Every structure is written in structure tokens, then in C-alpha cells.
Design an enzyme around this catalytic site. Structure first.
Site, short mmCIF file in Angstrom:
data_model
loop_
_atom_site.label_atom_id
_atom_site.label_comp_id
_atom_site.label_asym_id
_atom_site.label_seq_id
_atom_site.Cartn_x
_atom_site.Cartn_y
_atom_site.Cartn_z
N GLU A 1 0.82 -1.20 0.00
CA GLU A 1 0.00 0.00 0.00
C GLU A 1 0.87 1.26 0.00
O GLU A 1 0.59 2.21 0.76
CB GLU A 1 -1.01 0.04 1.16
CG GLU A 1 -2.05 -1.07 1.11
CD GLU A 1 -3.32 -0.70 1.87
OE1 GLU A 1 -3.22 0.19 2.73
OE2 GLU A 1 -4.42 -1.28 1.58
N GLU B 1 -6.70 -8.26 -0.84
CA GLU B 1 -7.30 -8.24 0.50
C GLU B 1 -8.80 -7.99 0.40
O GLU B 1 -9.23 -6.84 0.32
CB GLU B 1 -6.65 -7.15 1.36
CG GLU B 1 -5.17 -7.41 1.64
CD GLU B 1 -4.56 -6.29 2.48
OE1 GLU B 1 -5.37 -5.55 3.11
OE2 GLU B 1 -3.29 -6.14 2.52
#
Ligand SMILES: *[C@@H]1O[C@H](CO)[C@@H](O[C@@H]2O[C@H](CO)[C@@H](O)[C@H](O)[C@H]2NC(C)=O)[C@H](O)[C@H]1NC(C)=O
Ligand SMILES: *[C@@H]1O[C@H](CO)[C@@H](O)[C@H](O)[C@H]1NC(C)=O
Ligand SMILES: OC[C@H]1O[C@@H](O)[C@H](O)[C@@H](O)[C@H]1O
Length: 705
Positions: free
Chosen positions: A160, A229
Site C-alpha cells: 500500500e 485483500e
């Protein structure tokens, strides 16, 4: 014979496109005795892939000294996945976030000269490349990449980083490019991915994280669409509720993604497990990392989620020949209804009938047949005719959780922890206030900051009915203020606001007064731009008001430091014995007193079933069994939140289905059965706050329909 590549449609394994079903299981959040069972349940639950981060701080506790044993045996874990016939997505990072201590970075890394994390910084690049190369070489040496015949079909670099890059500018862009090229350059033979990284450079695949990712598109049309995710719940923080995410909404989110050309999705978490010991959890993260995962913290099936997603997987597998040999074709069915159709020249046909209405069931007609779609649901027709599965129609029974007391009534002894004072007879004195990580290097959660304050006999407060006022400001995360050996008060922070101010009247008397501040970290920050720069501990200001002089700032006087607790220095948690000491038993036993060690010897309960300690009668501290760190307890931190009843239908967010409000944020502490022996088990509790250990019980977990 063995290869991994990709195209616009899918990851391609040994020359065949695959719609891959994955779940996360973090190897150090369970024990090696649990791993085979968790993996078997994942396989029986319809997973093709196990996804895990690698946890650097766990593997490299000091520079160049590695740990790959016990629950940090990464190689053994991967070989078990291989054995079960599953692939692996290895998320190397080595920043991994993961509600894990310091985001995965060794605390020692922070103190390398010239170091700056997650940017175009030479010492960081050297250390990061070095550990990534270490992991890649170890996998290669064990033939664990799929290109070698092993399970690993892909690896992730960073985690991220896109949002960070965006905020920090040109040095972020440089580091992104560097990281991607360094990773691809290790020649793993299998694809690399980066999650939330719109600019991931070819040949890296950028991927999507979130509760929903159906609208996501990778950054090139020749890359497949992958969801790294699928959040299955949310994490539990100390002081927060136990968040849930309904199975029907998860199943809807997965169908929404798959119906829209998505070809890889991974449940985060699949098994969430436990933050054992004291170097696992991130800032204010609970010892439980249950996550409402398909497999609960203890490794039991979380029904009906587990079965409902198993059934979804079966439908996807029936659909897969159609899915891999066509592209989704959308036909509008109504105001809030669509058909996503995969029609192959081979004759295979799979269809997805959707109802996005969050309130009403709707009947659609598709290919001459009526199909009733509950609100916020998708039906899967693996042959374009028979709706074998609908994401809101749950054919698994629910199972409710029981934690039943077992054994009963341990025989306790106690030992009270010294309140130390600034005896100038301390190896750590400085003329100022030092940051806690810097002093402790995260070797203990505890740092004593201590100073003496002289009060003149002629102070006005001594004549008038009055006490002076002490203010102590801290960067956090808990502060205990002791004056002349007695606890004057305690304050503590939250995940979002770890900073503290103690302000209170203090019972100073004439002459020398001893101030001893016990500062406590509760895991270290693991997310945020520059999170590694944030401070912990008492940096001040520290002031006494109400004296004849006016106020007395104490920040520049001599401060004395003691790292850790006396019981830690004396190894009271240890099977050998923590420097022995005068333990007290029976009537004189310390009760609801701060800084008290307790210990008891116990026989293991019967059964094959998972175990925990019920710590509701306790406050805050640490637990060890047979010398092994079970984790922090903080049952004294009550869950606050909005625990409104929820429906599966409509857009989920992590606060929508919260439970356990007004209870201890974590009451039960998982004790792995494999850590016990039949008899003579040693339970040591450090109780920081105050508790009644007589109320501690072992409990056995079960779940029945
Ligand atoms: C699913 O994926 C395929 C391929 O990624 C999409 O097909 C493309 O559609 C665009 C716009 O119509 C064209 O310019 C491409 O050239 C098409 N590619 C191929 C190979 O057919 C398809 O539209 C996507 N479906 C949905 C519902 O999003
Ligand atoms: C860190 O520790 C050293 C002493 O070991 C000290 O000189 C320095 O000022 C400290 N800096 C902080 C606490 O920011
Ligand atoms: O549980 C929340 C998750 O948030 C994601 O953004 C992150 O990549 C994961 O590591 C985890 O922190």
C-alpha cells in the site's frame, strides 16, 4: 513444465489460466502444531492459494542475526501448504502493515545512521534490498517458487505504498521505481505484485485491497484484475469492539468482483489468529487478531461464514471453464439488476444475476426462466441455467461460541514489583527527557522516568490546606504517576490518540520528593506517513505549580531511567525462575494492587479442544505459560463503540456490525494446547493495573449449530 505468467484475463499456471481463490494465514499468528489443520481447513474451504506476509522484525531481531525457528519457520509453513496441494502468494514487503509491531520493521533499523523508511534513502534501500534478497534466496534454495516446482506463484513488494508516494512526492516516485526493479531483478520466475499502487511499473501487477473491489482495473489492459485483500471483518483494538462482517455481504462482494472479470481474490484474514508475546501486535492492537475470519482465532470453523464461502467457491469452480475462456458480458435486467455472462466458444456458459437493491427482493427473467434475487445478492448459474448458489441464501448453519470454564480454582502466589526511585545510583541518568523507543529499543514495554523534587519547608501549600499540581505530558501510551512510592494516578491513550496528559494534585511534603513515572508502550505504530518518526514516552512538558516560586518546569533536571520491570530483569516469567524472590501465598497475598506478579502451577485440562484464560478479573499486563509469552492482556480496557444491529444488505464499512460494546475489549486469551504438558504447567501473570487472580480460569472453546 512449471511456469507462472499472466495475460489480460488471468494468472496463467503451467500454461493454464486460473481463477484463483486465496486466503491469508499469517504463520507467526499461529503455532506449527496448528498450521497443518488450518491449511487442511483452508483446502476443504475451497482455497487454491495461501497468502502471507513475511515479518522482518520477527526474523531479524538484531542486525545479521536471523530467526526462522518455531512459529517463525517460514520454510516449514510454505512446505506444509505445498504438501496440501495449495499455492502461495508470498507478500514479502518488507513493510507489511498488518496491525503488526512497527509495520514489520526491526526497531534497530530506525537507528542506522542516515536512515529514513519507505523513501528514496540509501541506508533503507540497502537494508530493504538485503532482507528481500535474503528471503528470495531462501525460497530459491528450497525450490519453493512455482517456476521450480514449488508453491509460490507470486510475491508482493512493499505494501500500500501508492498513498504514501502520493503524499511524499518525487522521492516516493523514485523509491517505487527502485523497489519494483529491485524485486523483479531477483529473477523469481513468477510475477510480482504491488497493492494500491496505480503506477506500478511493468512487469509488476498492481492490485486492489478493500471491502469491495469490483470497479478496480489494473494499470495496463494486459495485466489481470486481482484483489489481494477481501476484508473479512476488521481488527480488534484494545478499547474497541469486536467488528464483524456478514458472510452474505462478503459473498456478494466476491461475486461482484468475479462477475466483473476478476481472476484472483484473497480473504484477509482467512485465519487471523493471535498476537502472541510482545513483539507481534501493532499500536493498541488486541492480542486477539480474530478478524471475524472464516477460521476463528482458535482455528475453529466460523459458521456460517466458512461454509457459505465454501459453497461460493464450489460455484466458482463449476463456472471456471467458462470464466477462463471468455470475458464478462453485461446485460442490464432492470433498475438495479444485471446479468454478467461468460460465454465460451467451447459451449461453456456461466452467468451471474445481480440485485443491487439493498431493500427489496426482485424477480428477473434470464433465458426464459424466472430467478428470485434477495436484496443485495448475486445468483451464480455455472451452466447459465441452474442457480446453484445465491450469496444471500445461506445453507450453512450458524455456530455460536462457548468458552466454558475448565479445571477451576488455581493456587496463586504473588510478588510485588518495586517502585524504583531516582537513586542517583542508576546507570541511566541524563539532564533531560529521552524518547522511549530510543532508550528501550523496544526490549520491554516499560520505561521508568524518575526525578527528585526538593520542597522548601516554607512552601505556602504546607501551611494552607493544599497540594501542588503536577502536569506530565507524554507521547504515550500509558502513564502511571508514582509520588513517594505511592501510585497517584494512571492515564492511558487510544489507537488514534496515544498521547497523554496527567494533571492532578500530588501529595508532596517538605524535603525531597520522589517522582517515578512508569511509561508503557502497547505495540508500536504500523501505518501512516512517517509513522516511524512518531514518539512514545514522556517527552514532557513536566511541571509543578502552586509553589512560592511560581511553577517549576522539571524537563531539564537530572532524569534517571530504568528499562523494563524488576520482574523482567529477574526473569520471573521463566520455568527456571525469575530471580526467585519472596513469593507470598494465602491471606497476605497481594490483591488489586498495581505492579504485581502472580504465579500458579496447573494440570492441563482434558480434551482436544482449544483453550484460553478468562482474564476478566484482571486489569492489564502480560501472560506466560511454561515461559512462553501468550501475549498482553488488557481486559480492563472496556470496548466502546456503536454496537447497532446490522443487516448484511447494503454497503459495508468496518463500524457497521460491531459487537461486545461495554465488555472487556478482550476477555479471553488464547493458550495453544501444544504449549502445555500433562502436569506442572507454570502460569505467570504480570498485573500492571490490579486484579484478583483467584478469578482467573482456563476455559475450553466449542461451537455448536
Ligand atoms: C471484461 O474484460 C474484457 C477484457 O479485459 C473486456 O473486453 C474489452 O472491452 C473493451 C471496451 O469494450 C475493448 O476495447 C477491449 O478490447 C475488450 N477486450 C477483449 C479482449 O475482448 C470486457 O469489456 C470486460 N467486461 C466487463 C463487464 O467489464
Ligand atoms: C537517544 O539516546 C541517546 C543516549 O543513548 C541520547 O544522547 C539522545 O539524546 C537520545 N535522543 C532522543 C531521546 O531523542
Ligand atoms: O487490517 C487492515 C489491513 O489494511 C490493509 O490496508 C493493509 O495492507 C493490511 O496489512 C491491514 O493493515
Amino acid at each position: 513444465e512449471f511456469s507462472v505468467s499472466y495475460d489480460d484475463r488471468a494468472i496463467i499456471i503451467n500454461g493454464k489460466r486460473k481463477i484463483l481463490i486465496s486466503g491469508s494465514i499469517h504463520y507467526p499468528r499461529s503455532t506449527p502444531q496448528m498450521w497443518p489443520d488450518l491449511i487442511q481447513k483452508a483446502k476443504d474451504g475451497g482455497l487454491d492459494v495461501i497468502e502471507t506476509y513475511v515479518f522482518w522484525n520477527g526474523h531479524e531481531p538484531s542486525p545479521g542475526k536471523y530467526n526462522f525457528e518455531g512459529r517463525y519457520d517460514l520454510v516449514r509453513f510454505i512446505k506444509m501448504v505445498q504438501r496440501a496441494g495449495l499455492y502461495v502468494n508470498l507478500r514479502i514487503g518488507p513493510y507489511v502493515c498488518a496491525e503488526w509491531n512497527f509495520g514489520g520493521f526491526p526497531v534497530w533499523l530506525k537507528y542506522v545512521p542516515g536512515m529514513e523508511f519507505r523513501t528514496n534513502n540509501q541506508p533503507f534501500k540497502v537494508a530493504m534490498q538485503g532482507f528481500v534478497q535474503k528471503i528470495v534466496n531462501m525460497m530459491k534454495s528450497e525450490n519453493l517458487f512455482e517456476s521450480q516446482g514449488g508453491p509460490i506463484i507470486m510475491a508482493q513488494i512493499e505494501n500500500e505504498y501508492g498513498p504514501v508516494e502520493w503524499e511524499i512526492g518525487a522521492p516516493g516516485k523514485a523509491y517505487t521505481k527502485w523497489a519494483a526493479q529491485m524485486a523483479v531483478g531477483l529473477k523469481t520466475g513468477v510475477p510480482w505484485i504491488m497493492c494500491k499502487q496505480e503506477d506500478a511499473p511493468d512487469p509488476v501487477i498492481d492490485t486492489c485491497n478493500g471491502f469491495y473491489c469490483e470497479g478496480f482495473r489494473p494499470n495496463k489492459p494486459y495485466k489481470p484484475k486481482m484483489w489481494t485483500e477481501v476484508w473479512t471483518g476488521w481488527y480488534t483494538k484494545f478499547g474497541g469492539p469486536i467488528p464483524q462482517r456478514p458472510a452474505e455481504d462478503i459473498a456478494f462482494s466476491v461475486a461482484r468482483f468475479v462477475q466483473n472479470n476478476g481472476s484472483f481474490f484473497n480473504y484477509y484474514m482467512y485465519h487471523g489468529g493471535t498476537n502472541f508475546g510482545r513483539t507481534s501486535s501493532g499500536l493498541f492492537i488486541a492480542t486477539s487478531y480474530d478478524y471475524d475470519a472464516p477460521l476463528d482465532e482458535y482455528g475453529l470453523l466460523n459458521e456460517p461464514k466458512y461454509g457459505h464461502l465454501r459453497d461460493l467457491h464450489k460455484a466458482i469452480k463449476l463456472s471456471e471453464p467458462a470464466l477462463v475462456s471468455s470475458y464478462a458480458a453485461v446485460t442490464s435486467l432492470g433498475s438495479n439488476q444485471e446479468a454478467h455472462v461468460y460465454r465460451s466458444k467451447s459451449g461453456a456458459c456461466a452467468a451471474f444475476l445481480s440485485n443491487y437493491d439493498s431493500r427489496y427482493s426482485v424477480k428477473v427473467t434470464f433465458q426464459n426462466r424466472p430467478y428470485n434475487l434477495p436484496p443485495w445478492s448475486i445468483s451464480i448459474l455455472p451452466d447459465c441455467k441452474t442457480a446453484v448458489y445465491n450469496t444471500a441464501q445461506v445453507n450453512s448453519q450458524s455456530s455460536s461460541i462457548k468458552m466454558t470454564p475448565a479445571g477451576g480454582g488455581l493456587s496463586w502466589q504473588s510478588y510485588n514489583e518495586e517502585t524504583p526511585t531516582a537513586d542517583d545510583s542508576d546507570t541511566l541518568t541524563a539532564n533531560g527527557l529521552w524518547e522511549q523507543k530510543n532508550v528501550t529499543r523496544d526490549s520491554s514495554d516499560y520505561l521508568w522516568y524518575m526525578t527528585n523534587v526538593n520542597i522548601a519547608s516554607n512552601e505556602g501549600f504546607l501551611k494552607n490546606g493544599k497540594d501542588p499540581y503536577l502536569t506530565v505530558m507524554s507521547a504515550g501510551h500509558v502513564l502511571h504517576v508514582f509520588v513517594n512510592g505511592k501510585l497517584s494516578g494512571t492515564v492511558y491513550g487510544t489507537l488514534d490518540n496515544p498521547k497523554l496528559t496527567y494533571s492532578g494534585n500530588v501529595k508532596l511534603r517538605a524535603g525531597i520528593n520522589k517522582i517515578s513515572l512508569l511509561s508503557v508502550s502497547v505495540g508500536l505504530p504500523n501505518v501512516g506517513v512517517h509513522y516511524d518518526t512518531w514518539n512514545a514516552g514522556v517527552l514532557g512538558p513536566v511541571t509543578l505549580s502552586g509553589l512560592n516560586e511560581g511553577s517549576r518546569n522539571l524537563a531539564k533536571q537530572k532524569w534517571s531511567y530504568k528499562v523494563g520491570l524488576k520482574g523482567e530483569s529477574l526473569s520471573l516469567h521463566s520455568l527456571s525462575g525469575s530471580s526467585s524472590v519472596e513469593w507470598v501465598r494465602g491471606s497476605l497475598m497481594a490483591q488489586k494492587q498495581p505492579l504485581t506478579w502472580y504465579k500458579a502451577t496447573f494440570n492441563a485440562p482434558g480434551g482436544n479442544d482449544p483453550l484460553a484464560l478468562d482474564m476478566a478479573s484482571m486489569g492489564k499486563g502480560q501472560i506466560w505459560i511454561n515461559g512462553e509469552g501468550v501475549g498482553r492482556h488488557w481486559p480492563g480496557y472496556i470496548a466502546q463503540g456503536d454496537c447497532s444491529k446490522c443487516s448484511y444488505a447494503g454497503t459495508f464499512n468496518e463500524k457497521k456490525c460491531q459487537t461486545n460494546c461495554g465488555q472487556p475489549s478482550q476477555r479471553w486469551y488464547h493458550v495453544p494446547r501444544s504449549w502445555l504438558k500433562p502436569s506442572g504447567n507454570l502460569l505467570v501473570v504480570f498485573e500492571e493495573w490490579g486484579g484478583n487472580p483467584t478469578g482467573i480460569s482456563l476455559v475450553r472453546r466449542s461451537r455448536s449449530a
